[PDB]
Amino acid sequence: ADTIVAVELDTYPNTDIGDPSYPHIGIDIKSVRSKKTAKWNMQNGKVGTAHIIYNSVDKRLSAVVSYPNADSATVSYDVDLDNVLPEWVRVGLSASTGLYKETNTILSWSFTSKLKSNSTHETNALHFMFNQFSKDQKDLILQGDATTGTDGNLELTRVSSNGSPQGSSVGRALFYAPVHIWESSAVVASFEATFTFLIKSPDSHPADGIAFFISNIDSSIPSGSTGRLLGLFPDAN
Ligand SMILES: [Ca+2]
Ligand SMILES: [Mn+2]
């Protein structure tokens, strides 16, 4: 039922459902089997940054993930969102752990969406920016194990009192207000999202990953979407 478009920062290779045999970033359109991926040199314990951009002229969804003094990974894919998503959506962040685990900490998150229409200066826009999360962040819909407040961060998956990440966890945070992502009379529709994150794992193999996603407004975590399904899809098709 849920329509999902996501950019995944996939830390664990599940080669049987299509993942490359290394940590990677990917663009997922309605399926966990990324339409395109790029090798990603994940760094256990360092704060990374992801930038996701899209505009309706090029109809190109792109993403870059980087770490200070290190190389960035980028991946792009041609997609006409007007054909995939409803015109009103919610945007959010999702992460999970399964048999293997890692912390999926979000330090900041900002988003900007703009619809420049056939009337010019008749632009509708939405922008939000979180550099700190409060214990009671009322403008975020928290699903599953996601929580805020710990040192002003958003922990998408369960982390015990001493900081150890737990397995079999899934959590998502969606911005409260629906977002008008496209409208047919719009000359140019575009958006940009940025978030900083901290993935740490005591394990040799961290899992499962973090994703930025856009979905139908009433999207909820699909049953059994812990692990490789990243809290976004009901199965691996
Ligand atoms: Ca994976
Ligand atoms: Mn993947």
Coordinates of N, CA and C and ligand atoms in Angstrom, one line a residue:
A1 N 0.9 -1.2 0.0 CA 0.0 0.0 0.0 C 0.9 1.3 0.0
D2 N 1.8 1.3 0.9 CA 2.7 2.5 1.0 C 3.6 2.7 -0.3
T3 N 3.6 3.9 -0.8 CA 4.5 4.3 -1.9 C 5.7 4.9 -1.3
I4 N 6.9 4.3 -1.6 CA 8.1 4.8 -1.0 C 9.2 5.1 -2.0
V5 N 9.9 6.3 -1.8 CA 11.0 6.7 -2.6 C 12.1 6.9 -1.5
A6 N 13.2 6.3 -1.6 CA 14.2 6.5 -0.6 C 15.7 6.5 -1.0
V7 N 16.5 7.1 -0.2 CA 18.0 7.1 -0.5 C 18.5 6.3 0.7
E8 N 19.0 5.2 0.5 CA 19.5 4.3 1.6 C 21.0 4.4 1.8
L9 N 21.5 4.5 3.0 CA 22.9 4.4 3.4 C 22.9 3.0 4.0
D10 N 23.2 2.0 3.1 CA 23.1 0.6 3.5 C 24.4 0.0 4.0
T11 N 24.5 -0.2 5.3 CA 25.7 -0.7 5.9 C 26.0 -2.2 5.8
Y12 N 25.0 -3.0 5.5 CA 25.2 -4.5 5.5 C 24.8 -5.2 4.2
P13 N 25.8 -5.9 3.6 CA 25.5 -6.6 2.3 C 24.6 -7.8 2.3
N14 N 23.3 -7.7 1.9 CA 22.4 -8.8 1.8 C 22.4 -9.1 0.4
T15 N 23.4 -9.8 -0.1 CA 23.6 -10.2 -1.5 C 22.4 -10.9 -2.1
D16 N 21.7 -11.7 -1.3 CA 20.6 -12.4 -1.9 C 19.4 -11.6 -2.3
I17 N 19.3 -10.3 -1.8 CA 18.1 -9.5 -2.3 C 18.7 -8.4 -3.2
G18 N 19.8 -8.6 -3.7 CA 20.4 -7.6 -4.6 C 21.5 -6.6 -4.2
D19 N 21.8 -6.6 -2.9 CA 22.9 -5.7 -2.5 C 24.2 -6.1 -3.2
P20 N 25.1 -5.1 -3.4 CA 26.4 -5.3 -3.9 C 27.1 -6.0 -2.7
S21 N 28.3 -6.6 -2.9 CA 28.9 -7.2 -1.8 C 29.7 -6.3 -0.9
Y22 N 29.2 -5.0 -0.8 CA 29.9 -4.0 0.1 C 28.9 -2.9 0.6
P23 N 29.3 -2.2 1.6 CA 28.4 -1.1 2.1 C 28.2 -0.1 0.9
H24 N 27.0 0.4 0.8 CA 26.7 1.2 -0.4 C 25.6 2.2 -0.1
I25 N 25.4 3.2 -1.0 CA 24.3 4.1 -0.9 C 23.5 3.8 -2.2
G26 N 22.2 3.9 -2.0 CA 21.3 3.6 -3.2 C 20.1 4.4 -3.2
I27 N 19.5 4.4 -4.4 CA 18.2 5.1 -4.6 C 17.2 3.9 -4.8
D28 N 16.2 3.9 -3.9 CA 15.1 2.9 -3.9 C 13.8 3.5 -4.3
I29 N 13.2 3.0 -5.4 CA 11.9 3.5 -5.9 C 10.9 2.3 -5.7
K30 N 10.1 2.4 -4.7 CA 9.1 1.3 -4.5 C 9.6 -0.1 -4.2
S31 N 10.9 -0.3 -4.0 CA 11.4 -1.6 -3.7 C 12.7 -1.4 -3.0
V32 N 13.1 -2.4 -2.1 CA 14.3 -2.3 -1.4 C 15.5 -2.7 -2.4
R33 N 15.2 -3.2 -3.6 CA 16.3 -3.5 -4.6 C 16.6 -2.2 -5.3
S34 N 17.6 -1.5 -4.8 CA 18.0 -0.2 -5.4 C 18.1 -0.2 -6.9
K35 N 17.6 0.8 -7.5 CA 17.7 1.0 -8.9 C 19.1 1.4 -9.3
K36 N 19.8 1.9 -8.3 CA 21.2 2.3 -8.6 C 21.9 2.4 -7.2
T37 N 23.2 2.0 -7.2 CA 24.0 2.1 -6.0 C 25.4 2.6 -6.3
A38 N 26.1 2.9 -5.2 CA 27.4 3.4 -5.4 C 28.2 2.8 -4.1
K39 N 29.5 2.5 -4.3 CA 30.2 2.0 -3.2 C 30.4 3.0 -2.2
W40 N 30.3 2.7 -0.9 CA 30.4 3.6 0.2 C 31.4 3.1 1.2
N41 N 32.4 4.0 1.5 CA 33.4 3.6 2.5 C 33.0 4.1 3.9
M42 N 32.1 3.4 4.5 CA 31.6 3.7 5.8 C 32.7 3.8 6.9
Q43 N 32.5 4.7 7.8 CA 33.5 4.8 8.9 C 32.8 4.6 10.2
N44 N 33.1 3.5 10.9 CA 32.6 3.2 12.1 C 32.9 4.3 13.1
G45 N 31.9 4.9 13.8 CA 32.2 6.0 14.7 C 32.5 7.4 14.3
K46 N 32.5 7.7 13.0 CA 32.8 9.1 12.6 C 31.4 9.7 12.2
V47 N 31.2 11.0 12.4 CA 30.0 11.7 12.0 C 30.0 12.0 10.5
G48 N 29.0 11.4 9.8 CA 29.0 11.7 8.3 C 27.8 12.7 8.0
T49 N 27.8 13.1 6.7 CA 26.8 14.0 6.2 C 26.2 13.5 4.9
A50 N 24.9 13.5 4.7 CA 24.3 13.2 3.5 C 23.5 14.4 2.9
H51 N 23.6 14.6 1.6 CA 22.8 15.7 1.0 C 22.0 15.1 -0.1
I52 N 20.7 15.3 -0.2 CA 19.8 14.7 -1.2 C 19.2 15.9 -1.9
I53 N 19.2 15.9 -3.3 CA 18.7 17.0 -4.0 C 17.9 16.4 -5.2
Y54 N 16.8 17.2 -5.6 CA 16.0 16.8 -6.7 C 15.4 18.1 -7.3
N55 N 15.3 18.1 -8.7 CA 14.5 19.2 -9.2 C 13.8 18.6 -10.4
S56 N 12.6 19.2 -10.7 CA 11.7 18.8 -11.7 C 12.1 19.1 -13.2
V57 N 13.1 19.9 -13.3 CA 13.6 20.3 -14.7 C 14.4 19.1 -15.2
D58 N 15.4 18.7 -14.5 CA 16.3 17.6 -14.8 C 15.6 16.3 -14.5
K59 N 14.7 16.3 -13.5 CA 14.0 15.0 -13.1 C 15.1 14.0 -12.7
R60 N 16.1 14.5 -11.9 CA 17.2 13.7 -11.4 C 17.3 13.7 -9.9
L61 N 17.3 12.6 -9.2 CA 17.4 12.5 -7.8 C 18.8 12.1 -7.5
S62 N 19.6 13.0 -6.7 CA 21.0 12.7 -6.5 C 21.2 12.8 -5.0
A63 N 22.3 12.1 -4.6 CA 22.7 12.1 -3.2 C 24.2 12.0 -3.1
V64 N 24.7 12.6 -2.0 CA 26.2 12.6 -1.7 C 26.3 12.3 -0.2
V65 N 27.2 11.4 0.1 CA 27.5 11.1 1.5 C 29.0 11.4 1.7
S66 N 29.4 12.1 2.7 CA 30.8 12.4 3.0 C 31.1 12.5 4.4
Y67 N 32.4 12.4 4.7 CA 33.0 12.5 6.1 C 34.1 13.5 6.0
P68 N 34.3 14.2 7.1 CA 35.4 15.2 7.0 C 36.7 14.6 6.6
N69 N 37.5 15.3 5.8 CA 38.8 14.7 5.3 C 38.6 13.2 4.9
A70 N 37.9 13.0 3.8 CA 37.7 11.6 3.3 C 36.9 11.8 2.0
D71 N 36.7 10.7 1.3 CA 36.0 10.9 0.0 C 34.6 10.7 0.2
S72 N 33.8 11.4 -0.7 CA 32.4 11.3 -0.7 C 31.9 10.3 -1.8
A73 N 30.8 9.7 -1.5 CA 30.2 8.8 -2.5 C 29.0 9.5 -3.0
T74 N 28.7 9.4 -4.3 CA 27.5 10.0 -4.9 C 26.8 9.0 -5.8
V75 N 25.5 9.2 -5.9 CA 24.7 8.3 -6.8 C 23.6 9.1 -7.3
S76 N 23.2 8.9 -8.5 CA 22.1 9.7 -9.2 C 21.2 8.8 -10.0
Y77 N 20.0 9.2 -10.2 CA 19.1 8.4 -10.9 C 18.0 9.3 -11.5
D78 N 17.6 9.0 -12.8 CA 16.6 9.8 -13.5 C 15.3 9.3 -13.1
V79 N 14.5 10.1 -12.5 CA 13.1 9.7 -12.1 C 12.2 10.9 -12.0
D80 N 11.0 10.7 -12.6 CA 10.0 11.7 -12.7 C 9.1 11.4 -11.5
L81 N 9.3 12.1 -10.4 CA 8.5 11.8 -9.2 C 7.0 12.0 -9.3
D82 N 6.6 12.9 -10.3 CA 5.2 13.1 -10.5 C 4.5 11.8 -10.9
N83 N 5.2 10.9 -11.4 CA 4.7 9.6 -11.8 C 4.7 8.5 -10.7
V84 N 5.6 8.8 -9.7 CA 5.7 7.8 -8.7 C 5.0 8.1 -7.4
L85 N 5.1 9.4 -6.9 CA 4.5 9.8 -5.7 C 3.2 10.5 -5.8
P86 N 2.3 10.5 -4.8 CA 1.0 11.2 -4.7 C 1.5 12.7 -4.7
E87 N 0.6 13.6 -4.9 CA 1.2 15.0 -4.8 C 1.5 15.6 -3.4
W88 N 0.9 14.9 -2.4 CA 1.1 15.3 -1.0 C 1.8 14.1 -0.4
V89 N 2.9 14.3 0.3 CA 3.7 13.2 0.9 C 4.2 13.7 2.3
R90 N 4.8 12.8 3.0 CA 5.5 13.2 4.3 C 7.0 12.8 4.0
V91 N 7.9 13.5 4.7 CA 9.3 13.1 4.4 C 9.8 12.7 5.8
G92 N 10.8 11.8 5.8 CA 11.3 11.3 7.1 C 12.6 10.6 6.9
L93 N 13.0 10.1 8.1 CA 14.3 9.3 8.2 C 13.9 8.0 8.9
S94 N 14.5 6.9 8.4 CA 14.3 5.6 8.9 C 15.6 4.8 9.2
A95 N 15.6 3.9 10.1 CA 16.9 3.1 10.3 C 16.5 1.7 10.9
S96 N 17.3 0.7 10.8 CA 17.0 -0.5 11.5 C 18.2 -1.3 11.8
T97 N 18.0 -2.3 12.7 CA 19.1 -3.3 13.0 C 18.4 -4.6 12.9
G98 N 19.1 -5.7 12.8 CA 18.4 -7.0 12.7 C 19.2 -8.0 13.5
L99 N 19.8 -8.9 12.8 CA 20.7 -9.9 13.5 C 22.0 -9.1 13.9
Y100 N 22.4 -8.2 13.1 CA 23.6 -7.4 13.4 C 23.1 -6.0 13.8
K101 N 24.0 -5.2 14.3 CA 23.5 -3.9 14.8 C 24.5 -2.8 14.7
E102 N 24.0 -1.5 15.0 CA 24.8 -0.3 15.0 C 23.9 0.7 15.6
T103 N 24.5 1.8 16.1 CA 23.7 3.0 16.5 C 23.3 3.7 15.2
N104 N 22.1 4.3 15.2 CA 21.7 5.0 14.0 C 21.3 6.4 14.5
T105 N 22.3 7.1 14.9 CA 22.1 8.5 15.5 C 22.1 9.6 14.5
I106 N 21.0 10.5 14.6 CA 20.9 11.6 13.7 C 21.2 12.9 14.6
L107 N 22.2 13.6 14.2 CA 22.6 14.9 14.9 C 21.9 16.1 14.4
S108 N 21.5 16.2 13.1 CA 20.8 17.3 12.6 C 20.1 16.9 11.4
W109 N 19.1 17.7 11.0 CA 18.4 17.4 9.8 C 17.7 18.6 9.3
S110 N 17.8 18.9 8.0 CA 17.1 20.1 7.4 C 16.5 19.7 6.1
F111 N 15.5 20.4 5.7 CA 14.7 20.1 4.5 C 14.2 21.4 3.9
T112 N 14.2 21.5 2.6 CA 13.6 22.6 1.9 C 12.9 22.1 0.6
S113 N 11.6 22.5 0.5 CA 10.8 22.1 -0.7 C 10.3 23.4 -1.3
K114 N 10.3 23.5 -2.7 CA 9.7 24.7 -3.3 C 8.9 24.3 -4.6
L115 N 7.8 25.0 -4.8 CA 7.0 24.9 -5.9 C 6.8 26.3 -6.6
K116 N 7.5 26.5 -7.6 CA 7.4 27.8 -8.4 C 6.4 27.5 -9.5
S117 N 5.2 28.1 -9.4 CA 4.1 27.9 -10.4 C 3.9 28.9 -11.5
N118 N 3.0 28.6 -12.4 CA 2.6 29.4 -13.6 C 2.0 30.7 -13.3
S119 N 2.7 31.5 -12.5 CA 2.2 32.8 -12.1 C 3.4 33.6 -11.6
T120 N 4.5 32.9 -11.4 CA 5.7 33.4 -10.9 C 5.5 34.2 -9.6
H121 N 6.6 34.2 -8.8 CA 6.5 34.9 -7.5 C 5.2 34.4 -6.8
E122 N 4.7 33.3 -7.3 CA 3.5 32.7 -6.8 C 4.1 31.3 -6.4
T123 N 5.2 31.4 -5.7 CA 6.0 30.3 -5.2 C 5.5 29.8 -3.8
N124 N 5.3 28.6 -3.6 CA 4.9 28.0 -2.3 C 6.2 27.3 -1.8
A125 N 6.5 27.5 -0.5 CA 7.8 26.9 0.0 C 7.7 26.3 1.4
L126 N 8.5 25.3 1.8 CA 8.5 24.8 3.1 C 9.9 24.6 3.5
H127 N 10.3 25.0 4.7 CA 11.7 24.7 5.1 C 11.8 24.5 6.6
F128 N 12.5 23.5 7.0 CA 12.7 23.2 8.4 C 14.1 22.8 8.6
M129 N 14.6 23.1 9.8 CA 15.9 22.8 10.2 C 16.0 22.5 11.7
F130 N 16.5 21.3 12.0 CA 16.8 20.8 13.3 C 18.3 20.6 13.6
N131 N 18.8 21.4 14.5 CA 20.2 21.3 14.8 C 20.3 20.7 16.2
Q132 N 19.2 20.5 16.9 CA 19.1 19.9 18.2 C 17.7 19.3 18.3
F133 N 17.6 18.1 18.9 CA 16.2 17.6 19.0 C 15.9 17.6 20.6
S134 N 14.6 18.0 20.9 CA 14.2 18.1 22.3 C 13.6 16.8 22.7
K135 N 13.4 16.7 24.0 CA 12.8 15.4 24.6 C 11.4 15.3 24.1
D136 N 10.7 16.4 23.9 CA 9.3 16.3 23.4 C 9.3 17.1 22.2
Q137 N 9.7 16.5 21.0 CA 9.7 17.2 19.8 C 8.4 16.9 19.2
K138 N 7.5 17.9 19.4 CA 6.1 17.7 18.9 C 5.9 17.9 17.4
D139 N 6.9 18.4 16.6 CA 6.7 18.5 15.2 C 7.3 17.3 14.4
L140 N 7.6 16.2 15.2 CA 8.1 15.0 14.5 C 7.2 13.9 14.9
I141 N 6.7 13.1 13.9 CA 5.9 11.9 14.3 C 7.0 10.8 14.5
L142 N 7.1 10.2 15.7 CA 8.1 9.1 15.9 C 7.4 7.8 15.8
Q143 N 8.0 6.9 15.1 CA 7.4 5.5 14.9 C 8.4 4.5 15.4
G144 N 7.9 3.3 15.8 CA 8.7 2.2 16.3 C 9.6 2.6 17.4
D145 N 10.9 2.3 17.4 CA 11.8 2.6 18.5 C 12.5 4.0 18.5
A146 N 12.1 4.8 17.6 CA 12.8 6.1 17.5 C 12.5 7.0 18.7
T147 N 13.5 7.6 19.2 CA 13.4 8.6 20.4 C 14.3 9.8 20.2
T148 N 14.0 10.8 20.9 CA 14.7 12.1 20.9 C 15.1 12.5 22.3
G149 N 16.0 13.4 22.4 CA 16.4 13.9 23.8 C 17.8 13.5 24.2
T150 N 18.2 12.3 23.9 CA 19.5 11.9 24.3 C 20.6 12.8 23.8
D151 N 21.1 13.7 24.6 CA 22.1 14.7 24.3 C 21.6 15.6 23.1
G152 N 20.3 15.7 22.9 CA 19.8 16.5 21.8 C 19.9 15.8 20.5
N153 N 20.0 14.5 20.5 CA 20.0 13.7 19.2 C 18.8 12.9 19.0
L154 N 18.6 12.4 17.8 CA 17.5 11.5 17.5 C 18.1 10.2 17.3
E155 N 17.7 9.2 18.1 CA 18.2 7.8 18.0 C 17.1 7.1 17.3
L156 N 17.3 6.7 16.0 CA 16.2 6.0 15.3 C 16.0 4.6 15.8
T157 N 17.1 3.9 16.2 CA 16.9 2.6 16.8 C 17.4 2.5 18.2
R158 N 17.0 1.4 18.9 CA 17.3 1.2 20.4 C 18.8 1.2 20.7
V159 N 19.1 2.0 21.7 CA 20.4 2.1 22.2 C 20.2 1.9 23.7
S160 N 20.9 1.0 24.4 CA 20.7 0.8 25.8 C 21.3 2.0 26.6
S161 N 21.1 2.0 27.9 CA 21.6 3.0 28.8 C 23.1 3.3 28.8
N162 N 23.9 2.4 28.4 CA 25.3 2.6 28.4 C 25.8 2.9 27.0
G163 N 24.9 3.0 26.0 CA 25.3 3.3 24.6 C 25.4 2.2 23.6
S164 N 25.2 0.9 24.1 CA 25.2 -0.2 23.2 C 24.0 -0.3 22.3
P165 N 24.3 -0.4 21.0 CA 23.1 -0.5 20.1 C 22.5 -1.9 20.3
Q166 N 21.2 -2.0 20.1 CA 20.5 -3.3 20.2 C 20.0 -3.8 18.8
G167 N 19.9 -5.1 18.6 CA 19.5 -5.7 17.4 C 18.0 -5.7 17.3
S168 N 17.5 -6.2 16.2 CA 16.0 -6.3 16.0 C 15.3 -5.0 16.4
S169 N 15.8 -3.9 15.9 CA 15.1 -2.6 16.2 C 14.8 -1.9 14.9
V170 N 13.8 -1.1 14.9 CA 13.4 -0.3 13.7 C 12.7 1.0 14.2
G171 N 13.0 2.1 13.6 CA 12.4 3.4 14.1 C 12.4 4.4 13.0
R172 N 11.5 5.3 13.0 CA 11.4 6.3 11.9 C 10.9 7.6 12.5
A173 N 11.4 8.7 11.9 CA 10.9 10.0 12.3 C 10.4 10.7 11.1
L174 N 9.1 11.2 11.1 CA 8.6 11.9 9.9 C 8.3 13.4 10.3
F175 N 8.5 14.4 9.4 CA 8.1 15.8 9.8 C 6.5 15.8 9.8
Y176 N 6.0 16.5 10.8 CA 4.5 16.5 11.0 C 3.7 16.9 9.8
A177 N 4.1 18.0 9.2 CA 3.3 18.6 8.1 C 3.5 17.9 6.8
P178 N 2.4 17.6 6.1 CA 2.5 16.9 4.8 C 3.2 18.0 3.9
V179 N 3.8 17.5 2.8 CA 4.6 18.4 2.0 C 4.0 18.3 0.6
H180 N 3.8 19.4 -0.1 CA 3.3 19.4 -1.4 C 4.5 19.3 -2.4
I181 N 4.7 18.0 -2.8 CA 6.0 17.8 -3.5 C 5.9 18.0 -5.0
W182 N 4.8 18.0 -5.6 CA 4.6 18.4 -7.0 C 3.2 18.8 -7.2
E183 N 2.9 19.5 -8.3 CA 1.6 20.0 -8.6 C 1.8 20.2 -10.1
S184 N 0.8 19.7 -10.9 CA 0.9 19.7 -12.4 C 1.1 21.1 -13.1
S185 N 0.6 22.2 -12.4 CA 0.8 23.5 -13.0 C 2.1 24.2 -12.6
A186 N 3.0 23.4 -11.9 CA 4.2 24.0 -11.4 C 5.3 24.0 -12.5
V187 N 5.9 25.1 -12.7 CA 7.0 25.2 -13.7 C 8.3 24.5 -13.2
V188 N 8.6 24.6 -12.0 CA 9.8 23.9 -11.4 C 9.5 23.5 -9.9
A189 N 9.6 22.3 -9.6 CA 9.4 21.8 -8.3 C 10.8 21.3 -7.8
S190 N 11.2 21.5 -6.6 CA 12.5 21.0 -6.2 C 12.6 20.8 -4.7
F191 N 13.6 20.0 -4.2 CA 13.8 19.9 -2.8 C 15.2 19.5 -2.5
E192 N 15.6 19.8 -1.3 CA 17.0 19.5 -0.8 C 16.8 19.1 0.6
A193 N 17.5 18.0 1.0 CA 17.5 17.5 2.4 C 19.0 17.3 2.8
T194 N 19.3 17.6 4.0 CA 20.7 17.3 4.6 C 20.6 16.7 6.0
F195 N 21.4 15.7 6.3 CA 21.3 15.3 7.7 C 22.7 14.8 8.0
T196 N 23.1 14.9 9.3 CA 24.4 14.4 9.8 C 24.0 13.2 10.7
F197 N 24.9 12.2 10.6 CA 24.6 10.9 11.3 C 25.8 10.3 11.9
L198 N 25.6 9.4 12.9 CA 26.7 8.7 13.6 C 26.3 7.2 13.7
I199 N 27.0 6.4 13.0 CA 26.8 5.0 13.0 C 28.0 4.4 13.7
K200 N 27.8 3.8 14.8 CA 28.9 3.2 15.5 C 28.5 1.7 15.8
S201 N 29.4 0.8 15.7 CA 29.1 -0.6 16.0 C 30.2 -1.4 16.6
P202 N 30.0 -2.1 17.7 CA 31.0 -2.8 18.4 C 31.3 -4.1 17.5
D203 N 30.3 -4.4 16.7 CA 30.3 -5.6 15.8 C 31.3 -5.4 14.7
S204 N 31.7 -6.6 14.2 CA 32.7 -6.6 13.0 C 31.9 -6.2 11.8
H205 N 30.6 -6.6 11.9 CA 29.7 -6.3 10.8 C 28.5 -5.4 11.3
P206 N 28.5 -4.1 11.0 CA 27.4 -3.3 11.5 C 26.2 -3.6 10.6
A207 N 25.0 -3.3 11.0 CA 23.8 -3.5 10.2 C 22.7 -2.7 10.9
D208 N 21.6 -2.3 10.2 CA 21.4 -2.5 8.8 C 21.5 -1.2 8.0
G209 N 21.3 0.0 8.5 CA 21.4 1.2 7.7 C 20.4 2.2 8.1
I210 N 20.5 3.4 7.4 CA 19.7 4.6 7.6 C 19.1 5.0 6.3
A211 N 17.9 5.5 6.2 CA 17.4 6.0 4.9 C 16.6 7.3 5.0
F212 N 16.7 8.1 4.0 CA 15.9 9.3 4.0 C 14.8 8.8 3.0
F213 N 13.5 9.1 3.3 CA 12.4 8.6 2.5 C 11.3 9.6 2.4
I214 N 10.5 9.4 1.3 CA 9.3 10.3 1.0 C 8.2 9.2 0.9
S215 N 7.1 9.4 1.5 CA 6.0 8.4 1.4 C 4.7 9.0 1.4
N216 N 3.6 8.2 1.2 CA 2.3 8.6 1.3 C 2.1 9.2 2.7
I217 N 1.2 10.2 2.9 CA 1.2 10.8 4.3 C 0.9 9.9 5.5
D218 N 0.2 8.9 5.2 CA -0.2 8.0 6.3 C 0.7 6.7 6.4
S219 N 1.9 6.8 5.8 CA 2.8 5.6 5.9 C 3.1 5.2 7.4
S220 N 3.2 3.9 7.6 CA 3.6 3.4 9.0 C 4.6 2.3 8.8
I221 N 5.3 1.9 9.8 CA 6.3 0.8 9.7 C 5.6 -0.5 9.3
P222 N 6.0 -1.1 8.2 CA 5.4 -2.4 7.7 C 5.9 -3.5 8.7
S223 N 5.0 -4.5 8.9 CA 5.3 -5.6 9.8 C 6.5 -6.3 9.3
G224 N 7.4 -6.6 10.3 CA 8.6 -7.4 9.9 C 9.6 -6.6 9.0
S225 N 9.7 -5.3 9.1 CA 10.6 -4.6 8.3 C 11.8 -4.3 9.0
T226 N 12.1 -5.0 10.1 CA 13.4 -4.8 10.8 C 14.4 -5.4 9.9
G227 N 15.7 -5.1 10.2 CA 16.8 -5.6 9.4 C 17.0 -5.0 8.1
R228 N 17.3 -5.9 7.1 CA 17.6 -5.5 5.7 C 16.5 -4.7 5.0
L229 N 15.3 -4.8 5.6 CA 14.2 -4.0 5.0 C 14.1 -2.6 5.4
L230 N 15.0 -2.2 6.3 CA 15.2 -0.8 6.7 C 14.0 0.0 7.2
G231 N 13.0 -0.7 7.7 CA 11.7 -0.1 8.2 C 10.9 0.5 7.1
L232 N 11.2 0.2 5.9 CA 10.5 0.8 4.8 C 9.6 -0.1 3.9
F233 N 10.0 -1.4 3.7 CA 9.3 -2.3 2.8 C 8.8 -3.5 3.6
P234 N 7.7 -4.1 3.2 CA 7.1 -5.3 3.8 C 7.8 -6.5 3.3
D235 N 8.5 -6.5 2.2 CA 9.2 -7.7 1.7 C 10.4 -7.3 0.8
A236 N 11.1 -8.2 0.2 CA 12.2 -7.9 -0.6 C 12.0 -7.9 -2.1
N237 N 10.8 -7.7 -2.6 CA 10.6 -7.6 -4.0 C 11.0 -6.3 -4.6
Ligands
CA1 CA 21.5 -4.3 3.2
MN2 MN 21.1 -2.0 -0.3

